[PDB]
Amino acid sequence: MIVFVRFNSSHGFPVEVDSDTSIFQLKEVVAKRQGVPADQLRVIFAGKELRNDWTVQNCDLDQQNIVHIVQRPWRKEMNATNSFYVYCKGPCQRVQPGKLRVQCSTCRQATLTLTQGPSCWDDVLIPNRMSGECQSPHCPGTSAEFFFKCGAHPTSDKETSVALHLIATNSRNITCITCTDVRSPVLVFQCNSRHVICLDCFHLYCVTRLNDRQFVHDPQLGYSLPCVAGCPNSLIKELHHFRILGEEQYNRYQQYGAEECVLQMGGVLCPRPGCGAGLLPEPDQRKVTCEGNGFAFCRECKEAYHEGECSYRVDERAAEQARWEATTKPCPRCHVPVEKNGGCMHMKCPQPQCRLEWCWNCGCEWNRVCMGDHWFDV
Ligand SMILES: [Cl-]
Ligand SMILES: [Zn+2]
Ligand SMILES: [Zn+2]
Ligand SMILES: [Zn+2]
Ligand SMILES: [Zn+2]
Ligand SMILES: [Zn+2]
Ligand SMILES: [Zn+2]
Ligand SMILES: [Zn+2]
Ligand SMILES: [Zn+2]
Predict the structure, then answer these.
(1) C-alpha angle 367/372/373, rounded to 5°?
(2) Region entry Necessary for PINK1-dependent localization to mitochondria: which residue ranges?
């Protein structure tokens, strides 16, 4: 039996299997075809992942179906303090806990005394949105500039990372829409229902819909994907979020609209996994080589050039389980209770004979580590 494997490319090259051929064996075959460890490969078919020990018959893989193969190792912390996540592009090259910092938006020093602590994303994302008096001599300094750095290791004061607004530490023990596991962290989709997806699933979701070319062109935004359950008006607008796919898959995303153009005209894409390059032959030509300015292929079947003939829904309970949205403490020194009034973890005690500033979560004296890790609740 012949199925088609899409591996980090939109053309599905063929592989022979029987009914009794296992998934982990199908992987082993594509693994040694492409110089890639099979303990990193993931079989995706009609939006469901196929398990190693399943067979073609267990999978109901008919003749001339199309599977996807994608390189993401499965990675098996729930109780984390942190509130924010950046994408660190060196060294880490992955999603890490963000460390939050503020400075005056004019002089650019750590001298801006904030009118009040932030409590939500818009406070620290939207420009000129919060305020204070800079202490710097002779600085007009009216506006706070919040910036994020990777938390995992030391960072200089200019070595910043982009925030991932959509990503949350899964403190609410919410299950994933696609795979139904309680994983942390998760990406919350900006649909009505706030459907939740784990980072693994997200990866697979993006890379398959990349190979399918089922990405959505929004006139006033570029190319993106909605919430996986097809929720209306849920395109991820904050396009820095497709950086969490790693350089290589992210680089395919940056080429997508360039490639879609080449097809618009009448050209066609090189099928090699790796080279996703666009080419513009004579409309009536059947032979096509990688000329921008590697190999020669057949315009029709997209194999090494030859002669004569060429050879979703999500679950209801999963989707309702996966919605992100579905008092006073004693002052650590004086012991008298205070309420929190918003999202901010910065507390001050109002008894004037103690007046301790403290972290609401930790019950310790307020400090840069709580400031950076969990200034506010999310
Ligand atoms: Cl975040
Ligand atoms: Zn880092
Ligand atoms: Zn200033
Ligand atoms: Zn998942
Ligand atoms: Zn949704
Ligand atoms: Zn090529
Ligand atoms: Zn052909
Ligand atoms: Zn007190
Ligand atoms: Zn704290």
Answers:
(1) 100
(2) 77-175
Is the preceding omega at residue 91 within 30 degrees of 0, hence cis? yes
Strand order in the sheet with 48-50: 13-16, 2-7, 66-71, 41-45, 48-50
Per-residue three-class SS string for 213-244: CCCEEECCCEEECCCCCCCCCCCCCCHHHHHH
How many whole angstroms separate alpha carbon 139 and alpha carbon 73?
A: 51
Query: Residue written as tokens 């082993």?
Result: 28
The strands making up 85-88's β-sheet, listed across from edge to edge, are: 144-150, 94-104, 85-88, 162-163
Cis peptide before 185 (omega within 30 of 0): yes
Longest dimension (CA), the chain: 93
- Rounded Cα–Cα distance for residues 305 and 288 (Å): 8
| Bridge partners, residue 22, by sequence | 55
148: phi then psi, degrees, rounded to nearest 5:
-105, 145
Question: What technique determined this structure?
Answer: X-ray
Beta pairing class for 66-71 and 2-7:
parallel
Q: 46: left (phi > 0), else alpha (psi -120 to 50), else beta? A: left
HSE-up of residue 368 (Cα within 13 Å, Cβ side)? 5
Give the residue ranges of the annotated binding site for Zn(2+).
176, 179, 191, 195, 198, 201, 227, 231, 270, 275, 290, 298, 301, 306, 310, 331, 334, 349, 354, 359, 362, 370, 374
Q: What secondary structure letter does DSSP report for 90?
A: T
Rounded to the nearest 10 degrees, the angle between the axes of helix 199-212 and helix 246-254 is: 40
Cα separation, 141 vs 325, in Å, equals 38
Q: Phi/psi at 288 (nearest 5 deg)?
A: -150, 120
Q: Are 305 and 297 in contact (CB under 8 A)?
A: yes
Reported resolution, Å: 2.8
Question: What residues are neighbours of ligand 1 (ion), with CB under 5 Å?
Answer: 84-85, 164, 167
Q: Which of 107, 120, 139, 344 is catalytic?
A: 344
CATH of domain 2-71: 3.10.20.90
